[PDB]
């Protein structure tokens, strides 16, 4: 008890000496420095082209290393591999559980990841001498639902659980080479940091945590939220990152400061948050609400640039080109659109 | 294939027999009902799946009554937090409720401030009250009822409800029951709750889920077809 | 991976003759298929294409309406048969598995083929030389001749560059002018130029002898050129 209680208030002074330096610091807030810019008017994006052939609710898609290519999985039980210049299948994957909520590219363009409530993370190579496609790995050392996943390298693989844990995997072996367990909230969400050495992630408890890839401690956290995180991603430069909340509420954080750049919201919007992805310069911010359309917003000015009101039902997915020309969304109406 | 090339041609049909796959995986698929078996804590829930049948985190169960392909999700073991999984079960035809009414006079295996009839009572107004469940029927079976009628006798059930006051016999204790986990539906019009007491026969149970699913086709077809 | 072919023999010339090819150890129900003639001491000539589903057939001008090509998916099948052989009708057949998708690379195995003795508008493939003498360690280049741009409004060039030894079935070392095959040295490379393309070898081994051909698939019929004999 007595302890517990000192050492609840070290870790206190701690936190109130870390905010006084962020106050400290922070002279001037990310608006306030960007405000002298110039803002963009008005941008509208037209759907060139829309994928259909899903018949169930779509939870994730991945775009290609090329630009060219990507991937969408749905409840259907199907895993499609979609051609955006043409609108032409490449493969379609039969899923051993219906239950998926995950689905990742590889960089190398040869192995895709899926994942869901069957705990279980499967592996298929698409580049195969035989004319189908099989299943090369099966990750079961989880014991939560699998919410995020995403290829490390063309060996190495990083999952985020239900279990409140994540795990750094090796493909070729099939079991577990560093456990990452600090949340105590179930995980929902991952992204790997343009350097590919760290990787954030977002879990339930209001709170993001930045992980170090080789070593495996707790290296950063943040808490900014008050409701469940359902989206991460990184800047594209690396040095920052947005998440998505449950609270009708996306925030900007930094990796180099422990700050909260900028909060977007609008008193419009009660819905929250499934999917949030940037721009190639990282001008644009793109978010998927549940109101049933997506949103663009100005990174440094706060402000909505664009509705790309498409869809018919809640958008789940959403994706950026590596050359950040066409913007790929998905939603519950099993519909994929290309906007350009 | 005015400006397509022959490898152009190819992948165009090589697409068309993907789509041409997908729709008939859909349309087989698009045929089988789908159940939700859900229990509170230690009831009568494998008892039912192994009437009814004569990868921890959901267990798949598949079977045929009547030339209909049953497929029950039980997914007591996902031990998460069911805000953040339940609206992938959004689409299902019906929920398999799990309540044992013999349990009234034994505490919770943790504390003993309730017994486990107020949990499931709990869990039971949270699952009806669901939002991705307005109009989702819920099947009760009420099983476990022969302990029950046994320790009615040496022990009344006036401990679990002090302003209750009846015969303390069988049937007046049973109907009590049943019209109090009645009680905790909130919508009444848009669903229904179907009540059942399970019998050492699997056909009175196989027989009564296969009532509640035909009944519920039927006023899902009658929706979407717009005669109601 | 392997294709085996039989029904090869002695024929008169008036008289039919099934070519039957059975395939082990891929999914052949998704290769679209290709029967390719190759006369003795000559040059090598397509006969006919199959698509994947049997939605597409295709068959040789000369021969047009005079062979017949039939697939058999749970068999894993592939029929050839011909109604009338002439005197021309004698050479080598070759059956050819090839999958059309993004990023796919048609034309990567050959089989072994069969012989057949008789007892007796179109982009033209043109290669200036036949022999040419070199020594092991130098590089040496092949040069094919086109007729017309092959390059289509997609944005790729629709030439292959394959590799015939001695005694053995052809295979494939580049595919769509720029793209080295599977399972191949990094030593071959192709370069294409409007009408002129050239397959480059930087490092000679005593493996790499044998007759070269260019290839066009740009629109069917499928004209062929002479390939280039390198020897030792």
């Known amino acids: 008890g007595s302890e517990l209680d000192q050492l609840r208030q070290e870790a206190e002074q701690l936190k109130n000496q870390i905010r006084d330096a962020r106050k400290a610091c922070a002279d001037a807030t990310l608006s306030q420095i960007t405000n002298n810019i110039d803002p963009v008017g008005r941008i509208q994006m037209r759907t060139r082209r829309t994928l259909r052939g899903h018949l169930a609710k779509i939870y994730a898609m991945h775009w290609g290393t090329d630009s060219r290519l990507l991937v969408s999985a749905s409840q259907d039980g199907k895993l499609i591999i979609w051609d955006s210049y043409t609108t032409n299948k490449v493969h379609a994957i039969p899923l051993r559980s219906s239950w998926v909520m995950t689905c990742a590219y590889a960089p190398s363009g040869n192995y895709v990841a899926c994942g869901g409530l069957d705990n279980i993370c499967s592996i298929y190579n698409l580049k195969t001498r035989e004319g189908n496609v099989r299943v090369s790995r099966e990750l079961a050392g989880h014991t939560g639902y699998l919410s995020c996943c995403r290829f490390l390298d063309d060996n190495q693989i990083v999952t985020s659980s239900g279990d409140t844990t994540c795990a750094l995997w090796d493909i070729e072996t099939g079991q577990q080479t560093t456990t990452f367990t600090g949340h105590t909230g179930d995980v929902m969400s991952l992204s790997l940091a343009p350097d590919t050495r760290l990787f954030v992630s977002g879990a339930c408890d209001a709170s993001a945590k930045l992980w170090d890839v080789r070593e495996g401690m707790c290296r950063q956290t943040f808490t900014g939220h008050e409701s469940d995180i359902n989206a991460i991603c990184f800047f594209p430069n690396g040095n920052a990152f947005a998440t998505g909340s449950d609270d009708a509420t996306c925030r900007l954080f930094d990796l180099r400061a422990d700050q909260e750049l900028m909060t977007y919201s609008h008193d419009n919007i009660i819905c929250g948050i499934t999917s949030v992805s940037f721009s190639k310069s990282g001008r644009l911010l793109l978010a998927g609400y549940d109101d049933f359309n997506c949103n663009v917003w100005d990174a440094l000015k706060a402000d909505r640039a664009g509705v790309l009101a498409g869809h018919d039902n809640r958008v789940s997915c959403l994706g950026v080109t590596d050359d950040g020309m066409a913007v790929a969304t998905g939603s519950w109406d099993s519909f994929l659109k290309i906007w350009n | 294939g005015c400006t397509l090339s022959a490898e152009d041609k190819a992948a165009v049909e090589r697409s068309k027999m993907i789509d041409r796959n997908l729709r008939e995986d859909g349309e087989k698929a698009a045929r089988e009902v789908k159940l939700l078996l859900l229990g509170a804590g230690e009831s009568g829930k494998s008892t039912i799946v192994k009437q009814m049948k004569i990868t921890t985190g959901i267990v798949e169960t598949h079977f045929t009554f009547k030339d209909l392909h049953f497929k029950m999700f039980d997914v007591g073991g996902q031990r998460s937090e069911r805000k953040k999984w339940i609206h992938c079960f959004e689409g299902v035809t019906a929920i398999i409720f799990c309540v044992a009414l013999s349990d009234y006079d034994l505490v919770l295996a943790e504390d003993e401030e309730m017994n486990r009839m107020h949990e499931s009572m709990k869990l039971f107004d949270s699952i009806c009250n669901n939002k991705w469940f307005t109009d989702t029927s819920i099947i009760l079976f009420l099983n476990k009822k022969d302990l029950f009628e046994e320790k009615i006798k040496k022990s009344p059930l006036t401990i679990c409800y002090p302003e209750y006051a009846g015969s303390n016999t069988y049937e007046e204790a049973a109907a009590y029951i049943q019209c109090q986990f009645e009680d905790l539906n909130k919508r009444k019009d848009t669903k229904e709750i179907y009540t059942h007491f399970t019998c050492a026969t699997d056909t009175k149970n196989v027989q009564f889920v296969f009532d509640a699913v035909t009944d519920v086709i039927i006023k899902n077809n009658l929706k979407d077809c717009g005669l109601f | 991976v392997q294709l085996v072919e039989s029904g090869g023999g002695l024929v008169q010339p008036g008289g039919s003759r099934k070519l039957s090819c059975s395939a082990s150890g891929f999914a052949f129900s998704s290769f679209g298929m290709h029967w390719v003639r190759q006369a003795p001491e000559k040059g090598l000539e397509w006969v006919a294409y199959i698509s994947s589903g049997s939605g597409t057939i295709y068959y040789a001008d000369t021969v047009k309406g005079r062979f017949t090509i039939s697939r058999d998916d749970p068999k894993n099948t592939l029929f050839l048969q011909m109604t009338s052989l002439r005197s021309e009708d004698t050479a080598m057949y070759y059956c050819?598995?090839?999958?059309?998708?993004?990023?796919?690379?048609?034309?990567?195995?050959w089989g072994q083929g069969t012989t057949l003795t008789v007892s007796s508008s179109d982009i033209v493939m043109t290669q200036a030389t036949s022999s040419v003498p070199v020594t092991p360690g130098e590089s040496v280049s092949i040069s094919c001749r086109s007729s017309?741009?092959?390059?289509?409004?997609?944005?790729?060039?629709?030439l292959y560059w394959f590799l015939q030894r001695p005694g053995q079935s052809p295979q494939l070392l580049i595919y769509?002018?720029?793209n080295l095959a599977s399972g191949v040295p990094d030593r071959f490379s192709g370069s294409g130029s409007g009408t002129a393309f050239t397959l480059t070898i930087s490092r000679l081994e005593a493996e790499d002898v044998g007759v070269y051909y260019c290839?066009?698939?740009?629109?069917?019929?499928?004209?062929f050129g002479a390939g280039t004999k390198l020897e030792l």
């Open positions: 017309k741009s092959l390059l289509h409004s997609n944005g790729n060039t629709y």
């Open positions: 769509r002018m720029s």
């Open positions: 290839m066009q698939h740009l629109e069917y019929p499928l004209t």
């Open positions: 050819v598995r090839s999958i059309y998708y993004y990023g796919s690379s048609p034309f990567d195995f």
